[PDB]
Design an enzyme around this catalytic site. Structure first.
Site, short mmCIF file in Angstrom:
data_model
loop_
_atom_site.label_atom_id
_atom_site.label_comp_id
_atom_site.label_asym_id
_atom_site.label_seq_id
_atom_site.Cartn_x
_atom_site.Cartn_y
_atom_site.Cartn_z
N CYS A 130 -30.85 -39.08 90.80
CA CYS A 130 -30.90 -38.74 89.37
C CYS A 130 -32.16 -37.93 89.06
O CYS A 130 -33.12 -37.98 89.82
CB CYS A 130 -30.84 -40.00 88.47
N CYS A 140 -36.85 -34.92 89.56
CA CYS A 140 -36.68 -35.88 90.65
C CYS A 140 -35.68 -35.42 91.73
O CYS A 140 -35.75 -35.90 92.85
CB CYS A 140 -36.26 -37.26 90.06
#
Ligand SMILES: [Cl-]
Ligand SMILES: [Cl-]
Ligand SMILES: [Cl-]
Ligand SMILES: [Cl-]
EC number: 2.3.1.9
Lengths: 391, 391, 392, 393
Positions: free
Chosen positions: B377, B90
């Site tokens: 994150c 991500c």
């Protein structure tokens, strides 16, 4: 703030296994953990000193989330270690080391691990998401679709290489002779114990079966010199030169290097193996990837102000015998100085790993003060190159 | 040499399309070409000035060889442009920007493009290579297998978020309120014209069909507030908190930024939007990824001697509403300064793109002199963060 | 009461039975079919042109190509004028083919036919539904399991259905293991005695750039370890189980074919018939109770012809599971020494579409002149077929 | 000497509507369509379900239907667990061959009452992957409709490409084929609007949870035509000088048909009025590529067997696998076109392959006038055909 000097303190790899061969039960990430753990042990440093990790890995499909994180944690490094997986196709393992060197140079980390990993044995097939077409569909092999097919030309790397063979007039026989030279150099180097500080053994354990200890490269033993000239030229029916024997094969393996700033090595009482002097990337027409390493190598030499004669040994990745020969011819270098201990044609080519392997091999094989130059072509028309000096 | 200062000259993105929605016909690399071409146009420079390209891309299976090279050549950039595809899950889109900055800081290039791209609509299913087991063959979904499953815990990202909700006491009603707030802010920003400079339109052309111009993010309209508190908790059926509405969604999109040294920006006489002040990666225990951005943001603040109060705008990637709430709770920052124009819960989350989008958004939304902090994150327990100041 | 043509068996030939992914696995069911059909016509000593029609049992037809029986027949070199039908009564298919062929012959609709069965379980494919792949992936199903081995109604394996009958009839693990060892014993003895000399024809497996393999005997019966039999775990039922991998039949490849004709045709063709087909029947019970369907089918045949169980010299009750045979012995109260005397599916293997033909063919060769043989075979869904023949 | 056989009568013939590919009946598996038709036929016959002794159903593409497709259809129609079942595969001839083989059992006096028919859900036919090692470079997922249903093994070409070979040989042109096709659609609509299938076809209720019930009461395919488009369509089975099109060929479809068959004796015992008598039937086979002509020989065999002349036949049902096939049959037998496929056929109504052979026999049963002869014939992949002669009672 000025750029920091970067040193290689250790360089370790697994043996390379043959496609569906001795290491085919191990995921790429596990081979990665083996190589990373070995490299850190060899560096003789606390593992907590390793601040961050980059690993090359071309065929990431089905390996699970964050392959580099898997390799890193599987090696027992701290959960605080950030991780990034690098994909420059065939150049990935070298580009990982380059990018890690840039972070160190910036003072953003003082110790890193960088390398590459690939398990071609475990690369899967894909089915498109959606409705199945009336009449059926072929599930594509990701080795072929993502690893080996040039997007723009819609042909295999092997067929692209034929273009260069034509243009530079590099015949079938010359390519076969190189290939035989590579196998010969590989066997001789294994027999002379030349990978003793470089390769670490892998124990393959199956429940109910005895352990198998893989301690050397598998591929080089699968050759028959008498059959080399008999093989068909599979990438081009008419006027072809590239074969299964004179091209690199499909393989499994991983390599990892411990990199530090000069100050970090001083602090940790470590005697580094080599200094990373410079590196570059070059790119040409996708079909002409075999020649990109010529440009990348020339960039590095011109940047540092060295002459080709100043290089003691060359590692020009053997994606095809054709590539090495194009490189020798264009750069006009002594062939006794090139891929001295074998290369990808006979040792095999786990694509994400090979760019790291060739740099770690120079680190071990160079004598004090000697410069080595490693270069590697990649799918899409690219190459990376790196200059190191033995300390 | 001394480290060079890095500036963001332009930042562009496609709209974000819903899963199997408005952009599903275009490959990730095509969206990449679109964003890349648009950023170069907005920067007002010749394409030839771009020296090298890094793109984040998490789910590369079946995209064909060298995704970043495809995006770059498809945008008409020179064949001499080296390309590398980045995978930090991500965080990929931000990490690409960070690594490009490091190369620029080293003086290794003077102008680069960096960003991220993902077409989750086109991510395929996989079949393992080998013998078909008796009793059936499993075709796994790469979105689930590589994108959304934590390796070590063997659970979805959404279940990891539940773990954080437990430990930090973040209830379902709190996460639902945050999500409603995200949707509200996204719609308000679209209606206010706040993406007029950031977003470029995409034309989807189908043989024998009229052209479709996609000019706005698709996802934020796909919500029913009255149903939000009634939805089932899909990642944990008993005492759950995370739902399909309060989680981010699967999406398609690309973003690209043109980065330069201060010297190159002056040479070419462009008007830089923002200076890159500092960036960092942090990592924690894998199940705890929702809090990794707290440590990564704290690292960047400490690095440059700034306090949380000095930040005008925070972009904390909305992987889950849970994540933003955990970050606000731990950092103790003003929620009115966080994800002010919406985020991934309502705009969508093409995973390899989001880290670049949020940096680009800060670049457009910050007022002169203001500091913006973006954090994201990633699967495996990591986070990246970047601090920029608007020029 | 109809006056029907008399039906005779002039030959009965089969390939050896190969193990799953074993000796015959490179050969499609239809190719095994061609081999058995050609062998049968050869042994009959008749022109290929004399065979007017062909029926072949074949349970798992998916992926075999268009008209499997036509492939086997044309593959044997029979005339393009030969009509072909592929028959599916699950495990009974090979027998039902012979029965239906007999009916045509009885009606005078044909005077000579080939009938049998074929199966290559090695080559049975996996399927994926037509349509849109669901988010999250899909399991492609194994057709052996889905079409071959799973009861539709109880949603359980055949082996688990068998456990039901083991319960009801008090047929314990030890008795079943004893029956199994006995089958393997009998199979080995029969092969060693040369009892299949005229029934089995060898097959040559040819792979380019490899030595040839001549498969000349059944592969499965050598794959037992008698010491491991009582130690095996009960696979279809962990709690109070009796059926194991060793005492159940296995997955296999093979084909069988019979030349059938009217008594008239035999005389015209100057060939000597082996046996007369006397009567046959189908019976059905609750799907879960398939192991007992052959009892009812056998009784129907006896009642129809007006014989007693004691008049049968030789019983072939298909060994789908050891349980099935014991269940038949128990309910019929017949002499175990007269049952499956030269082994059966538990040790020889069970290519499901061929077994019903194999066992009729075996009776044909093994019976002594004037003796009556009765063959019965249970099938998925709760059915069974049975056939009474008399040796000539 | 010739055997003395029981007389066999058709007491009822019932079918589902035929659904288009992925159309109105595509949620129902073949076996459920089977159950609907089987229950239909028994109800129409006016006998107890327990009178049916045994069942044969044609079904060409059995992959993934589960164990014993015919048993599923039968038990699903509420017939006793005591009823033996056999699934029949003579490709496109399966539905007719099932009736023929059941007739043989009745003739022998082996049963006195049977159900015979056919069923096919081409919408639900799956794809296949081979068992074994995945080959380097790719794994193929084959469409069983194509691989098992429509591809000639020997010539390795589509049925429609084999059809071109006969169009060539007998000089049957595109326009004649198209003319036939339009003729079929026209007859189909006419028959449907006249209420001619009032007793033959039974309606199907399609239930989806959350959705409004859909009642399928008529054949779907015949409304899917544009007569003006017909002459324009590309010849999809051959590049050079083609004649077969998607419009003048039959389509992929879903449906089932069942007939209640009994001996003359059982019909009396049960006090039922027989609909038709089953007189004779035959199978013929020719070169696989030449399957369009095989029904010619099969029909001739039947006429020759019974000593009837072509002119004695009041009504022909020559399965419209392709327009080409009906035309080839009309040409070679020299019969009155006005007597062929009177109320439509497979080009307009659709072709659920295991069902069609049973449908057309069921149709003669309803259409023929007292004492009239009907002849039904049907080609099949591999180069075969079945044919059946009936007389209305
Ligand atoms: Cl490149
Ligand atoms: Cl990380
Ligand atoms: Cl049955
Ligand atoms: Cl046929």
């Amino acid at each position: 703030p000025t750029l920091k000097e970067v040193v290689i303190v250790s360089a370790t790899r697994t043996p390379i296994g043959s496609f569906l061969g001795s290491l085919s039960l191990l995921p790429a990430t596990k081979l990665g953990s083996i190589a990373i753990q070995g490299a850190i042990e060899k560096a003789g440093i606390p593992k907590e000193e390793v601040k961050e990790a980059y690993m090359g890995n071309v065929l990431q499909g089905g390996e699970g989330q964050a392959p580099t994180r898997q390799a890193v944690l599987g090696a027992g490094l701290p959960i605080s270690t950030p991780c990034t997986t690098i994909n420059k196709v065939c150049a990935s393992g070298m580009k990982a080391i380059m990018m890690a060197s840039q972070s160190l140079m910036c003072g953003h980390q003082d110790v890193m691990v960088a390398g590459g990993m690939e398990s071609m044995s475990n690369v899967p097939y894909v089915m498109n998401r959606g409705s199945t077409p009336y009449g059926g569909v072929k599930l594509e092999d990701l080795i072929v679709k993502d690893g080996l097919t040039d997007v723009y030309n819609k042909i295999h790397m092997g067929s692209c290489a034929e273009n260069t063979a034509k243009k530079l007039n590099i015949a079938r026989n010359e390519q076969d002779a190189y290939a035989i030279n590579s196998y010969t150099r590989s066997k001789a180097a294994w027999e002379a114990g030349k990978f003793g500080n470089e390769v670490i053994p892998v124990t393959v354990t199956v429940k109910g079966q005895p352990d198998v200890v893989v301690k050397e490269d598998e591929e080089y033993k699968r050759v028959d010199f008498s059959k080399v000239p008999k093989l068909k030229t599979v990438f081009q029916k008419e006027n072809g030169t590239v074969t299964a024997a004179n091209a690199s094969t499909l393989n499994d393996g991983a390599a990892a290097l411990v990199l530090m700033t000069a100050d970090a090595a001083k602090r940790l009482n470590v005697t580094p193996l080599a200094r990373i002097v410079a590196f570059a990337d070059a790119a040409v027409e996708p079909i002409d990837f075999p020649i990109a390493p010529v440009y990348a190598a020339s960039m590095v030499l011109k940047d540092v102000g060295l002459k080709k004669e100043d290089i003691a040994m060359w590692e020009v990745n053997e994606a095809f015998s054709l590539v090495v020969l194009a490189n020798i011819k264009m750069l006009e270098i002594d062939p006794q100085k090139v891929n001295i201990n074998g290369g990808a044609v006979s040792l095999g080519h786990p694509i994400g790993m090979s760019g790291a392997r060739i740099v770690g091999h120079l680190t071990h094989a160079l004598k004090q003060g000697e410069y080595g130059l490693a270069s590697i072509c990649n799918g899409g028309g690219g190459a990376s190159a790196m200059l190191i000096q033995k300390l």
